[PDB]
Amino acid sequence: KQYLRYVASAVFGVIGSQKGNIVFVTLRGEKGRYVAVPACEHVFIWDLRKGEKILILQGLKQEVTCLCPSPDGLHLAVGYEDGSIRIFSLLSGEGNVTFNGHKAAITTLKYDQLGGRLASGSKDTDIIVWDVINESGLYRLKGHKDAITQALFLREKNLLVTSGKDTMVKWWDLDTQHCFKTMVGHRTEVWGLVLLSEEKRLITGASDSELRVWDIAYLPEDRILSCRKAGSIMREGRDRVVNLAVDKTGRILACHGTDSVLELFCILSKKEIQKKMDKKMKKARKKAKLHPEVNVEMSLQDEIQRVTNIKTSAKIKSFDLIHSELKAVFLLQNNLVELYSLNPVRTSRITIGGHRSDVRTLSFSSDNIAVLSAAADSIKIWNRSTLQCIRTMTCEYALCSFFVPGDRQVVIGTKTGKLQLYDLASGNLLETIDAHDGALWSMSLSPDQRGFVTGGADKSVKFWDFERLSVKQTRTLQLDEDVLCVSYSPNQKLLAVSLLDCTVKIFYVDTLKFFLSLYGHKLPVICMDISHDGALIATGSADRNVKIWGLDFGDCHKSLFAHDDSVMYLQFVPKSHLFFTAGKDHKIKQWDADKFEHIQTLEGHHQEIWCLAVSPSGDYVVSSSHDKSLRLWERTREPLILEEEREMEREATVKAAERIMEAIELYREETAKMKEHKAICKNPILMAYGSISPSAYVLEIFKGIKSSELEESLLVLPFSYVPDILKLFNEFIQLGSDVELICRCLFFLLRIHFGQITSNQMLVPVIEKLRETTISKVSQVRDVIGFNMAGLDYLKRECEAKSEVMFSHLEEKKRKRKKREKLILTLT
């Protein structure tokens, strides 16, 4: 009764995930040869010329969101959806640095020129700057109100500029961590932000055709720097700006919208700007001979010029530029990377290695060596061990496909009512049969090696046999509604079909006669499978439940919750009554049909799972998901015990009196230390509260004392600290700060230590300063309030005099009286 664990071995069929950014990397001294592309939870390094994967970098349970290569080239920073930041060494392939400051997906990662500081942006409205060499986080910036789009350093004055999904551009002084300047120009999201012309011009991309530029000059008055509106340049695309990028130490500015075309711009600087201005002036002089401020204005508009734009097959997600001829690499919705060369022509593609769409149908060969995966417009065959695509054939569409018992051929179904057959060696389509009127949904193989059965949107169910390979129709079975699934017993006796109505109807194969009906699902059954013995059939519906039925009498044994969403596929292992199911809740689960128990959960994928397939040996399972990836699981020798697995999911100050003593002692030590420091010319607690005098620090300690605990803390304090406190109290009254609190404390100590104070002659100077200060200050405060007596009372009488003039007199008197009656509670 012991179970065995299934473990994920490898991930294949993915070239590049739609989310992420493509970056060039430097390996073995070739700058443009190698590229780094993000996949689901992993990042892959590819060789464009060779077309193979040089290295893979391990990930942990979370998708990668953005990439940033280090300036030195040894490291590359990786950001994830969870919010953790990990840095990998390219040569070793192992990353040992983890940064987890953020709480949301890391939107951007950028380095400074030296490489010692790293700045990260997240969907949470924060920017965190990290110390790369020391592997620590320096500080967090909290100004923004929406998700962070871009963050860039400034080399000259140690400044950081950031943009966000809010309509704001914010300038930060990294020395003080203060936001000193904010731009409010834009009306919409600021998607792009780049620095050009040696940090003298600022370029922003927004959700409009116009592309704005500002000029920055270093020094509501402006602080540190000033920026003015230089102008705007038009964009051919009428949509939002997805990305703005400028290649390192180059003159090419690239603008990209949602459409497939990528727009390139070239800037003119240094002598080229001056030479163009001189040429324009000479032409203007020639025009004057034939028959300036306008010429200067023409030069300013023509400072940046439009070179020919690159066009791609499909829309672009991310791009990168390198300049020694310009080399541009691209990433599309299709898992396809392309390179174009321009001073445009396509130099290479890596289209081999993955389907162009999500894999809808998935099958294994009769032996375990081959794996069949088919999607829209493509069919590919995968070696299970070696893991490369053997052969590719174009197809109209893919919905269902079985592998014919002959190892040479394949058979697929289409959304159009057609069937196509191919040879693996020949790689060509044999013939196309208009099998069904509507969509063909399910296809089942016979127990004996002859024939197969098809069902689809056309309400009939048709039987086919093999006849160079060809198929012909023997007989058809006509039903009332649509057919979801067709699968018949390991013996050729019984046939089971699923209808659009929430029922599964069983028919005799020999006679095409009704035998049984299975009902009880709220939603129609998507997937069905029959055990090897034929005793049990398991049905899964769009409703979350899965039900086990016996074939002998049509009795329901059990109903299980299974997934949190609709179940997509179900299939038994060959040997025993164990089946695998996959649903839209990101999970794969296996169950024991006899004991009705949940044994395992596979948690590899990150999107909903379309299909699943189990090997005839039962060792290997392959699945497909909405994320464009294929994963392989294998059985392991390590035994699995249920309740030990079940618990795995369950797991997965100082008193007021003492404070005064320390404040006095700290004051005593420092005043000695400052005395020594001044003599030489001829602590951390203080900076913690901000740089203040040691006498000042004692004051807030007294303020921190609660009013109730004030009196007994003073009683506790010994007479040793009393003379120092009297000196410090005198300093407090002269400043005029919190005189009521200090005097209340001061009067209490004098009473309780009255006799001991009188004896000590050393205290004679102390009270003489105290006596003159205390009455002088208290009288001053009382006089200020006392002066407010006269002004307020006089102004009170003047307002009363004006009301007397108005006094209809009874109505005014009633109205005047009515205002001045408040209401109070009273127990009568």
Binding site: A439, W441, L484, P524, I526, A542
Partner: peptide, 8 residues
């Protein structure tokens, strides 16, 4: 309800 929504 159509099979395009539920399965495809």
């Amino acid at each position: 309800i159509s099979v395009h929504k539920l399965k495809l």
